[PDB]
Scaffold this active site. Structure first.
Site, PDB file in Angstrom:
ATOM      1  CG  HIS A   1       1.831   1.366   9.502  1.00  0.00           C
ATOM      2  ND1 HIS A   1       2.252   2.656   9.706  1.00  0.00           N
ATOM      3  CD2 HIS A   1       1.137   1.391   8.331  1.00  0.00           C
ATOM      4  CE1 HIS A   1       1.808   3.438   8.721  1.00  0.00           C
ATOM      5  NE2 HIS A   1       1.086   2.712   7.901  1.00  0.00           N
TER       6      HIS A   1
ATOM      7  CE  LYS B   1       4.249   7.264  -2.570  1.00  0.00           C
ATOM      8  NZ  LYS B   1       4.871   8.001  -1.406  1.00  0.00           N
TER       9      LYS B   1
ATOM     10  NE  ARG C   1      -5.758   4.073   9.989  1.00  0.00           N
ATOM     11  CZ  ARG C   1      -5.580   5.366  10.231  1.00  0.00           C
ATOM     12  NH1 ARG C   1      -5.747   5.872  11.455  1.00  0.00           N
ATOM     13  NH2 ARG C   1      -5.180   6.155   9.230  1.00  0.00           N
TER      14      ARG C   1
ATOM     15  CB  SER D   1       1.265   8.456   7.883  1.00  0.00           C
ATOM     16  OG  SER D   1       2.273   7.405   8.195  1.00  0.00           O
TER      17      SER D   1
HETATM   18  C1  LIG Z   1       0.893   1.479  -2.170  1.00  0.00           C
HETATM   19  C2  LIG Z   1      -0.611   1.339  -2.209  1.00  0.00           C
HETATM   20  C3  LIG Z   1      -1.025  -0.023  -1.708  1.00  0.00           C
HETATM   21  C4  LIG Z   1      -1.297   2.522  -1.560  1.00  0.00           C
HETATM   22  O1  LIG Z   1      -1.852   2.310  -0.324  1.00  0.00           O
HETATM   23  P1  LIG Z   1      -2.586   3.579   0.456  1.00  0.00           P
HETATM   24  O2  LIG Z   1      -3.975   3.176   0.796  1.00  0.00           O
HETATM   25  O3  LIG Z   1      -2.454   4.920  -0.242  1.00  0.00           O
HETATM   26  O4  LIG Z   1      -1.839   3.633   1.880  1.00  0.00           O
HETATM   27  P2  LIG Z   1      -0.282   3.993   1.808  1.00  0.00           P
HETATM   28  O5  LIG Z   1       0.231   3.192   0.643  1.00  0.00           O
HETATM   29  O6  LIG Z   1      -0.447   5.458   1.349  1.00  0.00           O
HETATM   30  O7  LIG Z   1       0.374   3.594   3.380  1.00  0.00           O
HETATM   31  C5  LIG Z   1       0.170   4.229   4.681  1.00  0.00           C
HETATM   32  C6  LIG Z   1      -0.580   5.579   4.391  1.00  0.00           C
HETATM   33  O8  LIG Z   1      -1.968   5.458   4.647  1.00  0.00           O
HETATM   34  C7  LIG Z   1      -2.341   6.170   5.805  1.00  0.00           C
HETATM   35  N1  LIG Z   1      -2.388   5.121   6.849  1.00  0.00           N
HETATM   36  C8  LIG Z   1      -3.015   3.916   6.660  1.00  0.00           C
HETATM   37  N2  LIG Z   1      -3.008   3.120   7.771  1.00  0.00           N
HETATM   38  C9  LIG Z   1      -2.357   3.858   8.706  1.00  0.00           C
HETATM   39  C10 LIG Z   1      -1.980   3.646  10.147  1.00  0.00           C
HETATM   40  N3  LIG Z   1      -2.344   2.450  10.712  1.00  0.00           N
HETATM   41  N4  LIG Z   1      -1.268   4.686  10.798  1.00  0.00           N
HETATM   42  C11 LIG Z   1      -0.953   5.859  10.144  1.00  0.00           C
HETATM   43  N5  LIG Z   1      -1.252   6.109   8.824  1.00  0.00           N
HETATM   44  C12 LIG Z   1      -1.953   5.182   8.095  1.00  0.00           C
HETATM   45  C13 LIG Z   1      -1.395   7.344   5.992  1.00  0.00           C
HETATM   46  O9  LIG Z   1      -1.991   8.702   5.933  1.00  0.00           O
HETATM   47  C14 LIG Z   1      -0.292   6.978   4.976  1.00  0.00           C
HETATM   48  O10 LIG Z   1      -0.316   7.895   3.870  1.00  0.00           O
HETATM   49  P3  LIG Z   1       0.825   8.984   3.390  1.00  0.00           P
HETATM   50  O11 LIG Z   1       2.211   8.655   3.858  1.00  0.00           O
HETATM   51  O12 LIG Z   1       0.776   8.867   1.877  1.00  0.00           O
HETATM   52  O13 LIG Z   1       0.231  10.187   4.119  1.00  0.00           O
HETATM   53  C15 LIG Z   1      -1.176   1.500  -3.607  1.00  0.00           C
HETATM   54  O14 LIG Z   1      -0.901   2.816  -3.901  1.00  0.00           O
HETATM   55  C16 LIG Z   1      -0.550   0.669  -4.645  1.00  0.00           C
HETATM   56  O15 LIG Z   1      -0.898  -0.472  -4.695  1.00  0.00           O
HETATM   57  N6  LIG Z   1       0.356   1.215  -5.442  1.00  0.00           N
HETATM   58  C17 LIG Z   1       1.122   0.529  -6.470  1.00  0.00           C
HETATM   59  C18 LIG Z   1       0.496   0.875  -7.825  1.00  0.00           C
HETATM   60  C19 LIG Z   1      -0.791   0.176  -8.187  1.00  0.00           C
HETATM   61  O16 LIG Z   1      -0.804  -1.071  -8.294  1.00  0.00           O
HETATM   62  N7  LIG Z   1      -1.826   0.983  -8.497  1.00  0.00           N
HETATM   63  C20 LIG Z   1      -3.064   0.539  -9.131  1.00  0.00           C
HETATM   64  C21 LIG Z   1      -3.991  -0.197  -8.254  1.00  0.00           C
HETATM   65  S1  LIG Z   1      -5.554  -0.503  -9.180  1.00  0.00           S
END
Ligand SMILES: CC(C)(COP(=O)(O)OP(=O)(O)OC[C@H]1O[C@@H](n2cnc3c(N)ncnc32)[C@H](O)[C@@H]1OP(=O)(O)O)[C@@H](O)C(=O)NCCC(=O)NCCS
Length: 163
Positions: free
Chosen positions: A19, A43, A92, A130
């Site tokens: 990140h 969550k 990635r 993560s």
């Molecule tokens: C928050 C949101 C953007 C989710 O993104 P996501 O793809 O699930 O990625 P996350 O938000 O989970 O952020 C980092 C996570 O991704 C992974 N990840 C991604 N890039 C990474 C990196 N460079 N290094 C380590 N982990 C990484 C991890 O496994 C980590 O997940 P965890 O803590 O849940 O195990 C999305 O859920 C959202 O927009 N939520 C708000 C509600 C919404 O609008 N929903 C409807 C959309 S139609």
């Protein structure tokens, strides 16, 4: 000549070196970058919102165009309220490419202005999750190679209760 403002949403639970790389690359190409920490009510994150913001501020607060904020609700409402030009996401080898198309295309149907941009981190972060980092720290391994030093200390301090 107007300003660009990109939102980088995630749970950042905790922030990792991948990140960090991403935000550093984004901050070079856009005028403002918002590290948007999804609160995660239904969550259950391991680290609270305050801990996740503070860990992110210590890794990235030396970049002066990067801001840090917690959000809940719909990404598209946050995007609108923030007057964003796009949402950034990390792609990635280990990404669910098809899940990203799905989010991008659904959010565009919720708001036709929504735009998504993707960056790809330095190859040496290509394989860090993560989830695995939490699992290694939970089983008392060493996470130093995957996360900033402040996150390593946060895992001890988490462990200085039951964990
Ligand atoms: C928050 C949101 C953007 C989710 O993104 P996501 O793809 O699930 O990625 P996350 O938000 O989970 O952020 C980092 C996570 O991704 C992974 N990840 C991604 N890039 C990474 C990196 N460079 N290094 C380590 N982990 C990484 C991890 O496994 C980590 O997940 P965890 O803590 O849940 O195990 C999305 O859920 C959202 O927009 N939520 C708000 C509600 C919404 O609008 N929903 C409807 C959309 S139609």
């Amino acid at each position: 000549m107007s300003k660009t403002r990109v939102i980088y949403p995630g749970t950042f639970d905790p922030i990792t070196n991948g990140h960090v790389d991403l935000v550093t690359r984004a901050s070079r190409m856009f005028d403002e970058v918002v590290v948007a920490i999804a609160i995660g009510h239904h969550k259950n994150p391991l680290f609270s919102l305050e801990e996740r913001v503070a860990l992110a501020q210590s890794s990235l607060g030396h970049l002066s165009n990067v801001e840090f904020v917690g959000f809940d609700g719909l990404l598209v409402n946050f995007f609108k309220e923030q007057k964003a030009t796009a949402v950034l996401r990390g792609l990635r080898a280990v990404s669910d490419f098809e899940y990203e198309f799905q989010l991008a295309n659904m959010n565009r149907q919720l708001d036709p202005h929504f735009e998504a941009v993707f960056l790809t981190p330095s190859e040496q972060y290509s394989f860090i999750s993560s989830t695995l980092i939490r699992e290694i720290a939970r089983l008392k391994g060493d996470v130093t190679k995957f996360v900033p030093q402040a996150v390593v200390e946060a895992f001890e301090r988490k462990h200085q209760q039951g964990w």
